[PDB]
């Protein structure tokens, strides 16, 4: 993976490049260097995360490290909060065309989740220019 | 004739209506036509036609020709009451400005009314108009401001006072507290939004120089863990747009930094009655977290005074301090690390500069986020809790060692009593970053410094290169010798053989010649390039002679204050009063806000004897008392009233001197026998430490 | 005649008024006199005179003689509307009950009205009366309750339904949510306060036994640091009065614990519509923190169902858990200690009893406050975060090892399917404290246990010694052989030679004779002392035969639950459903509350195939599925709807069995090809673990 | 100080018994075993605290240990809060006749402080049967 653009940036392309499937691929967390559980690999692909290359090696993130560092980023790098309507006015774009991730798990918000944000007047948060929301899994009490 | 078939008025048509309605002694048709066309937005769009379609001088003549009486002046009052609600929702929902830009006309017509200044519009007419103007689109506001920027200072003054007394009246008329806020008062909010348009008309209409901008401040890279996260999200390439800025700043393209000399002094836009009633704890909340009907006045910082702006910055740093508390707790919980919620700074009293240099440099590399923690200073040997008193002591100590003549960092000017960056200081970029960090740390930790800088230093900190105008404060003697050249009527080439080469005296005494141009010795100074030579001369000393020293100084200041709204809230002239304090020692305001403990009361016999002594103190002894009790001899922003001093009883009468808890501005006062004994011990206490 | 000079009425005076106003065909004077005397409190005080001065049977005859029509029944409706506001503020401000206790009369007169039950009083009349009654002083309420306690069950039922439908009507009539609470609704609050009077009339009017009380539970001593603080404040001698109790409990002198058989079942006092709308997060706040116009329904726990009471206890334990989080953070901050916000419990799977015994015993001595921390269980070797799944696994494991026959702690009864304390268990007081702690820990940490106990155990836990009535559930066979003696018509001395000496069979098989009296072999059983022998026989087995085993068991349960409102909120019959769960597996309610993740939805093809499989499951396979997914085979309080299960997608089709995250009731379901494959893998998954 | 009742329970009596004054007496904190500062001795006497005897030796408390353990007691042993009016109804006594200490520094509340509690509708807190309030020194922001 010496070539920067050639190396896969997503889990399906990485699996195809290594001639393996997401059902059997073996990955390590970029933070804790520990092998990812199978459900963690499935979450990684479901959360549309990017493969991280350290010293020419493909890495992923485990669930606990992802949530920990997302919490740290929310705590230390929070900028401001906006209403979904104000977000659309600022970008002149529908929320469905904006990449908004869950503040906790970094899962890209579905259009239904953004609609719920609009309906309940829940605010979207900005963390170093990244717009974050709350997903259903992390919204439940 | 009623004139019942005319919808648009004209500069001469109102004249003919007035003249035919004058000798007939019945103005009522004129009242009716004015109340008809002025209360209709579409009618006012086509009225008084010719980047605007309304003749500016035409309406001014019409208003002065027609407002001299007492009847029709009421019609304009009532027409504004009807027109405004039909023009506010028209802008809010219909989006009528996008269809045609001629809709801005009616706002020029209304604002040309002289009686808006009068106190009969503050009840119903002016508040409704301001609600409509605050709903103008950004592009519409851009043209209104640019049109308003061409006015004279007196015209801008009338515009500013118009919205100022509306804000003042509504603050006086209504009762605002923590229950009923000012942020949800739409009349004051709208008048503040309208005042912002005049404020930027003041900025873009004055002396604006948008070119002499310093290099973009080096943005500190986030922690390695944060960099890893952005890679996982696929956002490592794209970067954050930057700090919060006013949208009107972008649309106009001119910033208040670029404004050197506004038509009206900026301090005139501060509405004092609003500041005494604002609650900055919740104002800051509406600044960061958008609320449906709550408006942050930090979005319009020109209206806040230094005290209010200081509070809003304090809450921002405080909130960021707490976020570092929660992160360390999570690190101890999840990662099993040690609880370190402090920017721990172990230094030696005899080597404070070197110890703070190695400690703060090491932090700026490994964990640059530690600078956002609450500062904890502890000296070697002496062990104790740092509640703020040690940090105040440390901040005082570093300033003396930094600005001491022997270190060679700064050259002191006796006449101006100001320090300037020493160009002859080499291999000291680490120390210049240290004093930049210390200044940022003092702001972050709410400690004022005894720092004497020319205003050009604070201008350069915000990214404006010093110009010839700034040379007066820094080097007045050389500034005088340079403007004397500027207005020399005779031939400058003949009288004075000065060229584009300058001689600079080193600290040792050996002069080295510097060339402002490529070959300044060859090229002489003539009247044609006389202006350019002064520009290059001023650009060298203020910007290019100290570029490396100031680059490190600016870098260290940035790594502490980059995430703060400091650049947003404060102009460079307001930075000096923020970093330093007031030099005014109003000990009366100190008396009013002083609290008592240990059995003392405002009516205690020793307390009255104490205040009698300190009010008879000289200025030197007042400074000694302030430094001894609060750790600094300078008053905080505002005055000594903000220094909420506490005088606490400390045992019975004795020979022991009074003590002080500098961290909390607490004076520990024994119950001495008499006033003479109290003065002798108090004078002995403050003249020793 | 209008009868305009009479203020007090009489049992026979209303009769003469009615008879003279009957044949004259004009009842209007009767309407006027009733509306005059009933709307006046002082008039009603002297009306229908003779621990009360009003003849009880007199007014009942008067009401039934006079309410048979349709006109005067409206007068009583309107008289109550006027009398109540003049009698509520009269009690609240004037303090009229202290002056004379005869003022309670009017409340008996009003509550004797049969039409109060009717639905024409729920709008205006009954709500106003309940506001007045809730302002009665404690002494006044004591006599009303004692007077009401003499009624029959049917009479008490009418009284209870009267305030129940008022609560039901106001909940239906109004819209209550998190914005507009029920706690600030004074009509419902007053009707709840009035229902409490009927509730205690139900208690003190039934079978009350206040004598057979167990020894006061040993109060755990506070931490050594707390003991030092009380010495500094000079409060080490005086001790805290104890847990919160209802003031009406003290005034009446009878507790719901003392009530064995109330006239009305306690479950009838639960107002279901109120429970579905109550918010226990803020109800608990008003329970602990007094608020001016907010009323806690936890102060009247009889009205809450098991689910609502479980929530209020959960919030109390949760709040106490958080207070332990803040204390450890302060200990790490101030004292520089290690962050330990958990009741860490390292145990071995093969030695779970011994490892938990030494760990929990050591805590109960050194730091008894650690039991108030959130429980963290980790097994040796297997390393992972305990989010609740390991604690649920630990709780299940200890119950099996504790109640296993070989350990000798408990004897299992096949017929009742219940465990009883084994009297032949010696040198096991440490283990009995362990199972008491585990039961308290399961309550504290919101984990249900698979524990089968007779109701007498839960009665003794709250401090009531078992009686002969409790012997039926514990030992039905011996209970049958003892009541058969009770109703033996013949001479018990002649027919059966049983005496005051009993024979107990040991676990080994060797019987040892126990003497209930000093010399029970000498004294035979006669008809005179036949009752006493059964009382001593039942007192021995339930209380004295296992006194040491239960003392340790009760002590361990107390050190975890002493500060909880558990004793306040729950009756002993409600403890079993709190410690254990429902045995009912309503998988339909499980379907409604189930959530989906990983791309699954309620309409996913595999999701519908999944619910089709599990609804066709047998009871045994339903229990296997519950234990596999949630860690326990028992439903929580309420039902499986409270078990907010989550079915999350786990990759594509495969041969891998579905997995479960027991901590969060998450089922990890691969997207299998068909319904047959899904069942085979799901059955393989739950029948293996 | 073998005799329990004979040994002084207050700072002035302890000073008189040792033939010293509060101006010179040397005391150690019962918790940290560290010598009390002079201002700490004056606070101890002003806060009406009781001398604690450990192994037959008189001890006092320092300011930081007192505040720390008062905070711990408030966190872990808090029972419930009452309004001052409800307090008077419960005890049938004026607040001036009730010993209410500051929740933070354990200084007995003055009648003026209890009056302020009544006026601002500030609640009194119960901590193991000890009724606590907020003193002026600890009420300031
Ligand atoms: Zn990891
Ligand atoms: Zn999420
Ligand atoms: Zn101490
Ligand atoms: Zn205090």
Residue numbers in the entry:
A (entry chain B), D (entry chain D): 9 to 149
B (entry chain A), C (entry chain C): 120 to 169, 231 to 869
Give excerpts from the publication.
Human protein E6AP/UBE3A, the founding member of the HECT-type ubiquitin ligase family, was originally identified as an associated partner of the viral oncoprotein E6 of human papillomaviruses (HPVs). The E6 oncoprotein from high-risk HPV types hijacks the ligase activity of the host E6AP to ubiquitinate the tumor suppressor p5313, leading to the aberrant p53 degradation. The HECT-type E3 ligases have a characteristic C-terminal HECT domain consisting of an N-lobe and a C-lobe that are responsible for E2 binding and ubiquitin acceptance, respectively. Here, by using cryogenic electronic microscopy, we reveal that the structures of full-length E6AP and E6AP/E6 complex are monomer and dimer of E6AP/E6 protomer, respectively.
